[PDB]
Amino acid sequence: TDIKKDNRVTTLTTHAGIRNSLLTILDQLQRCQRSLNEFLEEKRSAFP
């Protein structure tokens, strides 16, 4: 949404500490992948 407000490319250098926001979003996506392992094996047993 804030990128939708201002679309100048050097605004990401000057936002409100985005670095830990990006790293934490990546880490939580890694963890929901590790939660999805079981469903992946279900669909692998589904289609050969």
Binding site: T24, D27, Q28, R31
Partner: protein, 48 residues
């Protein structure tokens, strides 16, 4: 007075230094990441 603080808040004030919190709370970032509790590691330690 120390027991009054440790009852009321959850911390004991002026007990640890600054250097003696990172090699001790360092094994808690993993469960801190997985559980969903945010902020620094010391609030998670106090909550436990």
């Amino acid at each position: 007075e120390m027991i009054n603080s440790l009852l009321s808040s959850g911390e004991v004030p002026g007990l640890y230094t600054l250097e003696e919190l990172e090699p001790l709370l360092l094994p808690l970032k993993d469960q801190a990441s997985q559980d969903g509790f945010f902020g620094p590691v010391f609030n998670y330690f106090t909550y436990r």
